[PDB]
Amino acid sequence: YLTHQQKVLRLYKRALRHLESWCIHRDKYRYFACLLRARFDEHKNEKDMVKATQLLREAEEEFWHGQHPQPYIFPESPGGTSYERYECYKVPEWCLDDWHPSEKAMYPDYFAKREQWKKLRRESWEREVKQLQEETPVGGPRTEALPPARKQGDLPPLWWHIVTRPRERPM
Amino acid sequence: SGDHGKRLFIIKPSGFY
Amino acid sequence: SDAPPLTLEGIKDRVLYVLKLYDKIDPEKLSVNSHFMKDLGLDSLDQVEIIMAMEDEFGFEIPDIDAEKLMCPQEIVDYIADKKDVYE
Amino acid sequence: SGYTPEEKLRLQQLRELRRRWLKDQELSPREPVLPPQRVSPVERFWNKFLQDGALWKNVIYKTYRHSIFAFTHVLIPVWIIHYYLKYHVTTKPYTIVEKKPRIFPGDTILETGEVIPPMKEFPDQHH
């Protein structure tokens, strides 16, 4: 749903690129982007909610008849060339423990530093959940927010997986 | 490669076997 | 891709120049903590242009939500580096 | 709405370790420590023999690669192919066929010794 306000911003954000796609040239697009800007400024001060409902409806059908068949896309996003083009090069962080000691011994700096992640994963384990138990709504969480740590030097609850994720470009 | 150090770790299954 | 590495400090001056290329952003009012809504007086319409300028300045698309919450340069700096895995 | 107070600090809470999670990837200079592996005497000579450099010295190394592969992979199979055809494939009937040579006026044969007639008298056009 995203409430009324967000929809215009998400539409306004998306609207420009397609316009830029048809006009292409920066100076040309910049010209009609201001003309496009001249639109949403007029209806910036609209207050009556039903009045604001009808206007945005038009921006849907109106946009549906202006969209470029081949708009420009950043390669690293859906519709881009570089989407899911380097996923395989990311590797699970949990495969190390199966490493033969020959491979493991090559990296003494790494594992000794890893032990401060597993140790930091387990020593902080018991406390963090208790932080959430009282911070979790009764009968089931209402929303998917994740509260932060609420003490000195406390890890955020459920932090391991997010932090321990790969890098965009590992090699 | 193009800089001193910046040698990134390699994560893989245990290929010794 | 040869070797154009990036650094946390380096992104900072890039952010400012994108913020310097904004006509409305006075050079003397441009700072890391300059909240767009308050310190720079830049509204949602103005902010999107910067984020759009940023998207063309880094070659990565920011999703819808990740452009809304950026109402100061520090969030962007806290945001770009996290996206581009920049650690040093 | 900007990042909420919980959001604002929480990302740094994770971003502290997310970035540090990249720091563990830092590698020791000695890596990848791997066994020396055997070096056959074929390599041993050319490891030092080619370290001086320059145009003259390394072309023979280029020619060596070309020459060694030539015998093993060009001169050997071509020799081998010859024997196969020359004593096993041809000996069978209708094995290797060839479209017969073209015949033109006034050409002499060798097996027979005969000579083809020339062509008729051209009208001597403006040519």
Add this chain to the structure above:
Amino acid sequence: GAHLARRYLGDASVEPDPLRMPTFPPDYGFPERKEREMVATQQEMNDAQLVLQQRDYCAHYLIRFLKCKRDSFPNFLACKHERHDWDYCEHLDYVKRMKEFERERRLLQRKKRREQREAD
């Protein structure tokens, strides 16, 4: 083509049948028609081994050009003197062919212009 409409839009009867021709007698309107002497002989063509699509009346001229190519190796352009003979000779056949294309048409026009009064 200007004549194309004269068939699919004009009176196609005068427009010849490009396949069935010659429809009227070859000797029609032409007494003592010469048989086009064939310079190249059946064994010579077999000796040449050319593709039958190339064994038309001007085979003799063509045969020489090919031989020069074989002799001219590595050169290929030497036979231009011989090249200018056959291809320019076939141009005479090319023109001579078009005579069949129209000569039949005029007999139909000749016939039409003759029987029209007979029936009217």
Add this chain to the structure above:
Amino acid sequence: GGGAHIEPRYRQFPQLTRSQVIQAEFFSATMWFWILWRFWHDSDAVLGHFPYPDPSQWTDEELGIPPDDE
């Protein structure tokens, strides 16, 4: 691995190397040379090596068309 042969730049025109400029322009110069040389040497091929007979100007003199009265 030559030690950062060319540095990057920020909003500036990237550095141009002498090898590319010499080779590109040397190669670029050679691009149009083959056009002129071939054109002049055998311009016979540009617009038909031989003329085409004018179909409208031919004659019943050689076409063998019987006279109209006949």
Add this chain to the structure above:
Amino acid sequence: MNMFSSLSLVTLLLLTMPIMMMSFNTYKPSNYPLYVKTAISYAFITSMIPTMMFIHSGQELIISNWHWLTIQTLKLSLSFKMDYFSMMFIPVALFVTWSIMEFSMWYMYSDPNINKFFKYLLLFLITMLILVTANNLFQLFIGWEGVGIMSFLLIGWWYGRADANTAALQAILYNRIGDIGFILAMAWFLTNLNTWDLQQIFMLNPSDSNMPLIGLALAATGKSAQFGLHPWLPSAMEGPTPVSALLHSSTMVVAGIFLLIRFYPLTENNKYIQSITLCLGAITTLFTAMCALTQNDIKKIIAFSTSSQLGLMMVTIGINQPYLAFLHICTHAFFKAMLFMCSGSIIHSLNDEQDIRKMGGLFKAMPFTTTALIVGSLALTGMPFLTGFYSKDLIIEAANTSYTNAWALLMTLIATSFTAIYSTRIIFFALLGQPRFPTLVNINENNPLLINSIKRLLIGSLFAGYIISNNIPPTTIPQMTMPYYLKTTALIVTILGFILALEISNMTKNLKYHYPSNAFKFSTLLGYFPTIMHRLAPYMNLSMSQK
């Protein structure tokens, strides 16, 4: 004779042993990229040695070194009918890929699968060589399918990519349908005739042969990415440009044409079959190019440029001009391979980007690419005294100078015209114009092989066409007599594209508005063929499968 025979097959046997180095031996690590390339270097030189004998002496030997099976009254064998086609074609594929192999070292520099790629790149060459030299359907068919397997893997090189997995399958799915016609020939010949080797069919010279040719047309369709079986070719550009250039723009999609040339004797006789071929070639070339004028990504335009060119290749078959169709493919192979490599310069220059709306001004930033992109397009445009002219001009004269279908024949004049319409867009959008590339520009072609590779191909696009056209044997009639407007209708109509295209290019800068055109959306979306087919049929089989 014996030298000619031995040197005929040394090349193939030369390529095999390097592959064995991946099963046995750990001799030379960290050199496979360069190591593999040199085989193609030597392969071209040695292969030309039979060629030069082939040119001078016209020696077309048949070699059957090993017998592999014999069933009752039908005998199989590993025969090598060294004939016109492979002797001249193989050198083209060898050298055309020579640049690609050397170039690919830098293009795929960051890939740890570079050895796998070099390993697999050669494997495709293995298929084509035996495929082209195949003297029999069975031997031919094995390669006829071999490319598909390599085609799938090389298309889906980035196995993480969602579309790449589908895209490789998408190519496969159409490819499978191709063999259906192929097997019919195999079935028809064994059923009616009693052998599959190409020799006996030409020996018996069937009087009535309508059905197997229909299979050949259908089989050629699948491998020729023609109208009806086109949609898969565009989707194969997801892979590396060398994969696209080497396979889907140089040789792989031309196999369907290749066989039709191999079976020229049968198709020609029944002009109805010739009529069948023209209809596909006519409709395909017009549609393929027509969509290219609109598509944004350059590689998409490049792919359709081959697709439109492919139409002429088939069209030449429809007029009983086999060796000429062979020429266009080889001449097309000379430069179209370069274009994608040159376009790769744009792809690598802009940090893996293809959309031309963020391109422009590379004339001074990348003159060398502008010195190489321009050159190849000239032959494609039909410019005189270029590899395209040495076939386009000669063949285009046959397009309207033989018994044809008017409606289909008109499709030829448009095709040549649309060929150059998109070409100015690529150069104008990418090379000329104001700088539209992003702020952080990494325009630096400082790699040796790229410079070296671009050099070598640029030689072929120019010198080869005259050499070949002045060195090929006479296998047809020289058709030079025709009205001058019909003589160079390509030149008359090719320039018309410039006039309208240049007007459009000027109309690009003009600050006038954009209008959604039905002839644009239809042509921009590729005429609804992919989207409608990629959404109708998939539901039917899966949804109805449960029943």
Add this chain to the structure above:
Amino acid sequence: MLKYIIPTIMLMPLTWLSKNNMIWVNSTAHSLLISFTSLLLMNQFGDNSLNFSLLFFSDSLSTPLLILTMWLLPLMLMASQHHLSKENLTRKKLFITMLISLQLFLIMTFTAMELILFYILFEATLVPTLIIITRWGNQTERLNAGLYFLFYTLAGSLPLLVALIYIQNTVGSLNFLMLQYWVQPVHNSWSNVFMWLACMMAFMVKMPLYGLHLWLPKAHVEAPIAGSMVLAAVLLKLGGYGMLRITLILNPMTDFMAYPFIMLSLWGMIMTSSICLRQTDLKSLIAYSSVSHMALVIVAILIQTPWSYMGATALMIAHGLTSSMLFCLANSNYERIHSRTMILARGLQTLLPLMATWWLLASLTNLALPPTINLIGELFVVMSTFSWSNITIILMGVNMVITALYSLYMLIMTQRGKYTYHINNISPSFTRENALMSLHILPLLLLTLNPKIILGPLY
């Protein structure tokens, strides 16, 4: 063939009397040696087959299966000891003993020179097969599958048993060689119709033919790795061998009788093939592979042309090697992710580098990559079928096109994509697995060097 029979038998005492911890040691080595000796049967002749005694005989049609058949046995022991390790010695040897017996019950099955003998030995095979699945099956949830086996014997074996015995009284004897000279034309009459069905129906359940295939997919859910491999490697081929065998005495009546089967067979392929796509179960789709494949063999037999039988011989050998490999390949996950769910795990290429190779290498043969034997047979079917009726080409055309779909669907759905995050136990490929798989592709490919042996006596 006593030379082959007895050495297998003594392996049963080998299990009991061997070093308790060396039961896996001796079995493979001792069993393997038998595999090498298996080759000696290949002393075939052009015209006459190889007949030893009044009981046992071998020929081109049965020779490759015998050599193939024994080959499987060591592999089944290999694939099992991981999960049989959980079992105790007192009950562990019970698993090997049954497998050893089934080898005796099989080799003699393909060399029975008397049809009743063939039938007898053939019938007993279900006991080793069933007890293998039932007692030592991972599932014991009362699938109620007794109906199928109840139905099978009622409509299959039992009518077949009576059918055979009826022939012996009339002709005089049921020796397979003897019928080669005393077979008589079987005119179209009501009685022979029923004989024809009983003489054919039993096998169709085991090919399995279309409409009767409901039982096969469920088996691999229950049967452990060992049972599954033999089911498609061996047990399915029994029907084909019998059908190829008994069909010597069904002329000319088989002509009109064939059509109802053929349409099921020809149409069943596309239905069976496309159903592969909707099979959410690894083992089911792997099972479905056999269903469509064998349908080709059936038609080749019914058209009963000299060319066709060559394809079935090649096809029968070809498929069994592949699917038997596939079960272990897919089963290799069941020993890691502890289920048969295809979609659950993905992208095995990164966590198991080599393993994706085997999926690639084996998948090609399934989709008939030339010149592999698979295409040699499958293609031979197309040639022979087309002569029967040109319209048949379309069904073959579509089926092969469909074949590539699932041939690559699992190879895509499992060997690519993001590693499942919550999955964290993906261990490196084991030596047992690496070697065990290699035993399949190698001979399957190496047969391409000398495919002549697997062309049936027709060649």
Add this chain to the structure above:
Amino acid sequence: HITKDMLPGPYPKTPEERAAAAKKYNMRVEDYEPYPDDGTGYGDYPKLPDRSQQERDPWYDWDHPDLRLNWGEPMHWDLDMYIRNRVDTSPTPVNWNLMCKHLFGFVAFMLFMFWVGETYPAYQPVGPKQYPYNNLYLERGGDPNKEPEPVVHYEI
């Protein structure tokens, strides 16, 4: 090892059966609905909108990211068919009803023109070609016994 009742069951013939039924699938009874009761007998599994998994936005973080599915979600009956590579129903810029009509017209015209072209083909203003030796009948493997009927081409 899940409880029996926590597995798909017969059609809930009364809302009270739905009230407990939707609890097994965890779905709100308001959206939960079993497929229509008939001989079909799918059970009581959710009758979710028959749509494409692609619809769920990728940038949402799920427990099955590429699958874009949340753990414990009630799967789709045709889920194995609606996955990304399989059946997809992403909206298009142009109407499906119009696009199908537009595409058919394009082809339906193309075929018609070819028939006219094949009913009105092209031929240059020239007659039939001429070949001596009675059309090379003997050179095409003709019969020596029978003399080909002469086809003589005169000068012209």
Add this chain to the structure above:
Amino acid sequence: SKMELPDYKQWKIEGTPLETVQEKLAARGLRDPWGRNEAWRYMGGFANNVSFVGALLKGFKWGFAAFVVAIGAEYYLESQK
């Protein structure tokens, strides 16, 4: 790196066709908010863009210079045999 940046004030619509864009939007009652952003695209030599004819007349005199020498050699050489 330190990565010195160019001065933003250097890139302005003045002296470039961007200026007259502001003129048109100025006439309509508006102004371009990113004119200086695009200025670098038309400054520092980036304004210099060669028209299609220029792409069709690249190095003509360099080609034409040798063209005179190319045909000139034949003219005198033919006289000198």
